[PDB]
């Protein structure tokens, strides 16, 4: 009939988009520089709304994974470069009886450019390689090395991702929501929750649990080359420690250049390891094999094994504990074939010369942590990898790092608001 | 009324969502509260906020709708855009369903609103020339 167009401004309509999200806080991650998080976190429920999500096409995980890499390189700029340490090392074994951590001495530069000094230090064997006894730092024939500033914090801080004005973040309050599909119960938030950027491997640490039951993800579970993300609903307690009482020695290697070395080990020499409750891990491995039958069959066998090969950062549980990077042999956790007081101890190693991420260009020297190291964490997730009939084996994997933040950013999605709507109604303007 | 909040009626009828426009009209620009990572990235987001906002105000200005939340015009509703009844729209499909059906013709309508305004102040220009 007499229908003319009428412009509406401020209508609830959005589109899929990817913008530059900013961080909010309440260390390396420079969380002091983010906007102070609002004490009132407004969450508005979008009743009658269904939205299509996909944690694998999600861009917040691609942006954050670069926002952590760009945070790592940003924090090591003013820190001391350990380039003169790439010198011929004279190493022995530290007195004991396995000869792991070495005792190396070397002619080192001083504050005066014409004076040398014969100083010594301890290096784990993972940081050195022989020549033909003579050694050298592992990174010398590859890249330069920057020592981490001993005043920045390696501690994961709850980081909040927020969308700019005119954009919005879409939550998903579905408590059985697998990664993809349409979330039936959707709400909107100005900022995400407290994301702890815990760099982990194989076993996701300190993550957010799942309500109701434990779900597993993976974009296509039948594609064996897709990392399966399992998310526990109850937390399995894991305790880790480096029992050796270490010492840190400051070595002046120039005008203001002070390399911090491992002096000696006070007291006993022991072995760094981790503990989990075998009962809690047995029931949790039961919870994972429960949901695994809904995708593979109620009669097929499910086998667990350790890694099949690759780098050190993937074949072992690698993480941070008090400020030092463990590499925990997880073969004692994945050794159970399922069909139908306790304490499991993992032998962990320690590295100081790491590259992190997987970039070829720069390695970081972590100065040794003084005192005895022990940290208590929860493992909340798991990154598995299946291997030709009706019996599926599963092994841990940790190829890509951005699968970590993806296990926390699956509940979110960025959309842009376009508040311009044109719709007809029997309305016209005068003359 | 019920304070559903920001985008509270995204799944509701176009007749119910049209009565709560000043809710999404506030939070489209939010507000106020130097070289690092988020520092440069925050300023890049603060500029983009006012650009997308001024585009929607510039478009509203050249249509004669500057200051309106609901604005009536002269362009008649072409049946080729959507040959749907008035009751099967405002008391049925949502604003999200509406934008998908009009996504094609939405550019033609934006041009019809511009000249419909220029050929209105030009007519009023002659209306006050005496």
């Amino acid at each position: 009939e007499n229908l003319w167009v009428t412009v509406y401004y401020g209508v609830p309509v959005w589109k899929d988009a990817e913008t530059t999200l900013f961080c909010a806080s309440d260390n390396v991650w420079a969380t002091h520089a983010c906007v102070p998080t609002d004490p009132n976190p407004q969450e508005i429920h979008l009743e009658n709304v269904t939205e299509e999500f996909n944690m694998w096409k999600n861009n917040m995980v691609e942006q954050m994974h670069t926002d952590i890499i760009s945070l790592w390189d940003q924090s090591l700029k003013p820190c001391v470069k350990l380039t003169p340490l790439c010198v011929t090392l004279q190493c022995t074994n530290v007195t004991n009886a396995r000869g792991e951590l070495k005792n190396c001495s070397f002619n080192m530069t001083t504050e005066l450019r014409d004076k040398k000094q014969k100083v010594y230090s301890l290096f784990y064997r993972l940081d050195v390689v022989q020549i033909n006894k003579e050694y050298r730092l592992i990174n010398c024939n590859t890249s330069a090395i920057t020592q981490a500033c001993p005043k920045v914090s390696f501690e994961p801080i709850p980081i909040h991702y927020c969308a700019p004005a005119g954009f919005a973040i879409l939550k998903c309050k579905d408590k059985k929501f697998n990664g993809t599909g349409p979330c039936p119960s959707v709400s909107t938030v100005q900022c995400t929750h407290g994301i702890k950027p815990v760099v982990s491997t194989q076993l996701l640490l300190n993550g957010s649990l799942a309500e109701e039951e434990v779900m597993i993800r993976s974009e296509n579970i039948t594609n064996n080359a897709k990392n399966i993300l399992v998310q526990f609903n109850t937390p399995v307690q894991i305790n880790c420690t480096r029992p050796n009482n270490n010492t840190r020695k400051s070595i002046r290697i120039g005008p203001g250049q002070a390399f911090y070395a491992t002096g000696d080990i006070i007291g006993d020499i022991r072995q760094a390891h981790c503990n989990v409750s075998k009962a809690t891990w047995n029931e949790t491995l039961g919870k994972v094999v429960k949901q695994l039958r809904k995708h593979f069959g109620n009669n097929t066998i499910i086998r667990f094994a350790n890694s099949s090969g690759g780098d050190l950062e993937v074949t072992t549980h690698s993480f941070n504990c008090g400020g030092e990077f463990f590499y925990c042999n997880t073969s004692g956790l994945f050794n159970s074939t399922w069909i139908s007081n306790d304490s499991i101890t993992l032998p962990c190693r320690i590295k100081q010369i790491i590259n992190m991420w997987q970039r070829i260009g720069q390695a970081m020297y972590a100065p040794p942590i003084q005192g005895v190291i022990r940290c208590v964490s929860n493992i909340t997730g798991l990154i598995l990898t299946r291997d030709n009939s009706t019996t599926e084996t599963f092994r841990p994997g940790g190829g890509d790092m951005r699968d970590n933040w993806r296990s926390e950013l699956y509940k979110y999605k960025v959309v842009k608001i376009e508040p311009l709507g044109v719709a007809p109604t029997r309305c016209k303007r005068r003359v | 009324a019920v304070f559903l909040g920001f985008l509270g009626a995204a799944g509701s009828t176009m007749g119910a969502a049209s009565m709560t426009l000043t809710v999404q009209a506030r939070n489209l620009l939010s507000g106020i509260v130097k070289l690092t990572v988020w520092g440069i990235k925050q300023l890049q987001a603060r500029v983009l906020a006012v650009e997308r906002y001024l585009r929607d105000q510039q478009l509203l200005g050249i249509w004669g709708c500057s200051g309106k939340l609901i604005c009536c015009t002269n362009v008649p509703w072409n049946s080729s855009w959507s040959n749907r009844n008035l009751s099967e729209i405002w008391d049925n499909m949502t604003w999200l369903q509406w934008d998908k059906e009009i996504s094609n013709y939405t550019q033609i309508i934006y041009g019809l609103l511009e000249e419909s305004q220029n050929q209105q102040e030009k007519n009023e220009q002659d209306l006050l020339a005496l």
Partner: nanobody
Amino acid sequence: QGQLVQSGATTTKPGSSVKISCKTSGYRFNFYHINWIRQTAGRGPEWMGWISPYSGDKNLAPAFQDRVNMTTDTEVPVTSFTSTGAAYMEIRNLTSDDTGTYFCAKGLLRDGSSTWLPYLWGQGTLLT
């Protein structure tokens, strides 16, 4: 703009109860009422009652309030505006007078003065 397929033509005898289904598709199942209408051999058509898949609210005629068992599941959402729901139908004191063809019906609008009016009908189910 979707289908509302029902069950078959199950014929029983008086005194018993019969279950009738109504599987929806092509539309948001929780946005529209589900009416139930029948046309028996002895009268014309008679409005039985509707139920809200969203509010879970019922309103049925007094001629069928003490006989009709009417329930709905919860939709399995396919897309943002598509879903797949189900509406169930059962009677109590069955006679040969209730012999007729039964169908479900999706509501007309989502608001206004004709929110529940049976617009999109099923296919029909022959009773006893």
